[PDB]
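Protocol step 4 of 6: structure prediction from sequence.
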Amino acid sequence: IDPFTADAGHTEFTDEVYQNESRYPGGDWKPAEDTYTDANGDKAASPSELTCPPGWEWEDDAWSYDINRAVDEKGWEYGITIPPDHKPKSWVAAEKMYHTHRRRRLVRKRKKDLTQTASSTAR
């Protein structure tokens, strides 16, 4: 994303994973039931396990936290699990006591730089 080259032909996608903790509403957090998750809750791989495939180049330096969203300073979103329900279906940018869950997107965008996987193994 610079105004000198037209940043599209590259294929770069922001790779992400929401880490979370769980606590009683107004309590002490422990690792969540599914620590690494998707925004919905689908357990995903962890940033270390998250590696570059043949054809993909990491663009960003490590997994950081995404602050380009309506999220807390450290990325933590307001996931309150009001019974009955299994998951937070609402997220807000403020650490509120009703937080049963909180999660944040660790970000590491990646880029194919177009040329890395440009040709495919023809069989």
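Step 5 (inspection) to follow. Residues 1-123 form one domain.
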